[PDB]
Design an enzyme around this catalytic site. Structure first.
Site, mmCIF file in Angstrom:
data_model
loop_
_atom_site.group_PDB
_atom_site.id
_atom_site.type_symbol
_atom_site.label_atom_id
_atom_site.label_comp_id
_atom_site.label_asym_id
_atom_site.label_seq_id
_atom_site.Cartn_x
_atom_site.Cartn_y
_atom_site.Cartn_z
ATOM 1 N N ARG A 1 0.828 -1.202 0.000
ATOM 2 C CA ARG A 1 0.000 0.000 0.000
ATOM 3 C C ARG A 1 0.862 1.251 0.000
ATOM 4 N NH1 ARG A 1 -3.416 -0.986 5.237
ATOM 5 N NH2 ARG A 1 -1.337 -1.716 5.849
ATOM 6 N N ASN B 1 -6.212 -3.004 2.105
ATOM 7 C CA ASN B 1 -6.197 -4.422 2.379
ATOM 8 C C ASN B 1 -7.605 -4.939 2.588
ATOM 9 O OD1 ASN B 1 -3.158 -4.681 4.481
ATOM 10 N ND2 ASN B 1 -3.440 -4.599 2.256
#
Lengths: 90, 90
Positions: A19, A37
């Protein structure tokens, strides 16, 4: 043209800086949207912007950060909504 | 860095000019390798060259030519083999 890609990204894709690295690359390229996520171990993302920039980020996403191992990316093309900036949301 | 990506591309991806258009985009980007149709309805390709160029072409392959409807792409990273030109091989 402006395009919007909605991705689901699978493999070793959590706990590897995916990320943070996707956000870095998005901001480098001027892609807007978000990444998060999911509880099933996958990563979900919306990428919106100039199609060449979005394509560059999608290609990057199959490599990922060094420890990432991306086994597949599912893609749905969507109508652009006016995303501005890129952020991590989950 | 120089990389080699081995792709399988799924969706409405045959009979839409995917092979010819991928070859054109590869030649524009300076990517070497090949593309072919598989009997399961998918497209298989090998993309080799500078990492930024390869990633650009991987991303393009999530869109394809206008009438393609790509649903997923799978990439396996491989050792470069010195591919020359970008060929349609099946």
């Amino acid at each position: 043209a402006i395009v919007r890609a909605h991705l689901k990204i699978y493999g070793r894709v959590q706990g590897v800086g995916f990320r943070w690295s996707m956000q870095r690359e998005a901001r480098k390229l001027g892609v807007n949207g978000w990444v998060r996520n999911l509880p099933d171990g996958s990563v979900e993302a919306v990428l919106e912007g100039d199609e060449e920039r979005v394509e560059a980020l999608i290609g990057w996403a199959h490599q990922g950060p060094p420890l990432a191992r991306v086994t597949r990316v599912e893609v749905k093309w969507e109508q652009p909504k006016g995303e501005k900036g890129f952020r991590i949301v989950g």
